[PDB]
Amino acid sequence: SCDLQATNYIRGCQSKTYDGKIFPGKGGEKQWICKDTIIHGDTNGACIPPRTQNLCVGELWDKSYGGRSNIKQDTKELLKEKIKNAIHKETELLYEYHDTGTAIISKNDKKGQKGKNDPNGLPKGFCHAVQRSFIDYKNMILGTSVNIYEHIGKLQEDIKKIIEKGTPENVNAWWKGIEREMWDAVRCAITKINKKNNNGIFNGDECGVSPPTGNDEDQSVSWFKEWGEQFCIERLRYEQNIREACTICINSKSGDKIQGACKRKCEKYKKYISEKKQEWDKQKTKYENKYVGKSASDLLKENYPECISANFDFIFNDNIEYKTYYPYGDYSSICSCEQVKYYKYNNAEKKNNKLLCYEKDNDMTWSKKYIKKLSLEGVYVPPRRQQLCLYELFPIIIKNEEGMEKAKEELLETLQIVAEREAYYLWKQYNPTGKGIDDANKKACCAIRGSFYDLEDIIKGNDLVHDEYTKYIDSKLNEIFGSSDTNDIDTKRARTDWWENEPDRKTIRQLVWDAMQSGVRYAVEEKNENFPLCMGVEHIGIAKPQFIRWLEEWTNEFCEKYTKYFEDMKSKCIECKKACANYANWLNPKRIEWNGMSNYYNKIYRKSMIMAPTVIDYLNKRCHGEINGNYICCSCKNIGAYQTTSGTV
């Protein structure tokens, strides 16, 4: 039902070149620009996409010399028609650009041209590109600190004139009203491809009925999502190339090194990351400042299915020790000739790389983020759970795609390493934290047991947090252990069985516990101290449900930190006003956490009663008196009986 210019020539609006020229052409590739420019201005932590830099402005602006708007002597309907034509031509141009398979987004990860098409007959990436382009029209018609073209700012103020001299900021409103008719330029130009196609039916609603959503309205995030889609899409291409040269590595050195095409393919990725890190580092900092509590890594992992195998924390690391140990980061384990093996405590010669997890932060807070789907709302994640030493597990899981024996073989020895390192580092955190010596390690033997159980729940697939790491680990373990033929029920029982049982008499649950004693043995050896009794136990009691374990962790901590604050405030009791400000500053997020945590307890037990005691009651038995280094791990100066009055209103 549109009479708008179909086989139209908009001046200056020719075929796209941002991702390079369409063959037989070659080059003209525009690059992401993140820094401030004389041409574009302040980006403000943002990176301008090449797709943006090639926007079809056509008759609205002229690039000849400095660049000037033609819009000066235009009317309101004249200006709308121009925007409508420009938008319509940009979709047409973006059809060709993707149908040719020139746009990085329109590329495949292995299969040349084969399988790079969505449900409809529209090329891979066409809709995303068109959607993004539409947002750029919106932001260009309104006010933006980034100038897509050299002097285009002039156009935005001239637009003001037209809209101010019309029937009724006013333009922020004019776009609001005009936007539907502007999006229909996208839909009606999509209808045109059907006429071109034979038995390939089109109607326009294939890229959506309405113009891009709420989240995307923010140029900054629309551009960041594109950066993400492209990074992931390119990253899987670097993967395939590493996999064609490494699984399909010659020990040259004095020892096991990659040297041929494998070194070449891995270095190509190592170089790729070295480049893309600045763009990430910038856009991460700016996004997360614009959206508190929101994670960059999430905005991407959600929207783009190619990002599933991606872990930005591991790819884009600031840790020097990591950068050398994992030189290819993400694909390090694949780009390594070195045999995946955990070395037992008094194994002659060769020792494990206790190649540090990040420095465990004591100042860290509890979190309701990265929590599992199924409600589970109310539960808080402990800080020492958040500082999990399961980093080594991520590259090795990426390595083994075919989840056969080798996958679960390599995972087992990597589990033992992860287990050793965590235990090593926890001792170094909790022993310098403890009061007495026979109390410092008594406090340490529990953080260890906690993590042993949490590490256990992760593998068993019983854990309550699918974070930057554990999310893909759950997905891959379900791949490795369960088939499509066997439901989740057998899959849960597959992981639980692998861990619980097993050459030697030792089980996978046992080898992980043995490995944890080894880490404490090296930690205590360093300080020339004696290995504790709480750590020397062949067996660890059956883990309590994670929620209840974590609820005890919360309570033990609160009790200590309360008797710290309240006591050091009362002692100082004006100067109290600053002590009160601190005590209350700490306590306010505790009230939020206690309500949530104690509410869950009742939902899972007490409420529809059911022969279960109260939250306080349970914790009263659990925290009365001194600590034990095994399953008796909570202590309070005053029993929880007062805590609900302390933590409410």
Residue numbers in the entry: 1218 to 1385, 1399 to 1478, 1486 to 1491, 1494 to 1613, 1618 to 1745, 1751 to 1821, 1836 to 1870, 1882 to 1922
Question: What's the publication's text?
Answer:
Pregnancy-associated malaria (PAM) results from the accumulation of PEs in the placenta via attachment to the glycosaminoglycan chondroitin sulphate A (CSA) present in the intervillous spaces. VAR2CSA is the only member of the PfEMP1 family that has been associated with PAM56. The extracellular region of VAR2CSA comprises six DBL domains (type ε or unknown (X)) and a CIDR (CIDRpam) module arranged in the following configuration: DBL1X-DBL2X-CIDRpam-DBL3X-DBL4ε-DBL5ε-DBL6ε. Here we report the crystal structure of the DBL3X-DBL4ε double domain from the FCR3 strain.
The structure was solved and refined at 2.9 Å resolution. The polypeptide chain of the refined structure could be traced from S1218 to V1922 with gaps Q1386-T1398 (DBL3X), N1479-K1485 (DBL3X), G1492-Q1493 (DBL3X), E1614-R1617 (DBL4ε), A1746-G1750 (DBL4ε), D1822-N1835 (DBL4ε), N1871-S1881 (DBL4ε) and N1923-M1950 (DBL4ε). Both domains display the helical secondary structure and the pattern of canonical cysteines characterizing the DBL motif. The double domain forms a compact structure with a short linker (interdomain) region connecting the two DBL modules. The DBL3X-DBL4ε interface is extensive and includes 18 polar interactions between residues that are largely conserved in sequence. A total surface accessible area of 1340 Å2 is buried at the interface between DBL3X and DBL4ε. Contacts between the DBL3X and DBL4ε domains in the crystal structure are made essentially by invariant or highly conserved residues, suggesting that these also occur in the full-length protein and contribute to its compact organization. Subdomain 2 contains the conserved four-helix bundle (αH2, αH3, αH4 and αH5) but, unlike other DBL domains, αH5 possesses an 11-residue insertion (N1744-K1754). The canonical Cys(-1)-Cys(5a) disulfide bridge, linking subdomains 1 and 2 of PfEMP1-DBL domains, is absent in FCR3-DBL4ε structure; this absence is characteristic of the DBL4ε-VAR2CSA domain in other VAR2CSA variants. A novel disulfide bridge, however, is observed between C1689 and C1906, connecting Subdomains 1 and 2 of DBL4ε-FCR3. In DBL4ε-FCR3, however, the interval between the conserved tryptophan residues comprises 18 amino acids (WWX18W), of which 11 form a loop with no regular secondary structure.
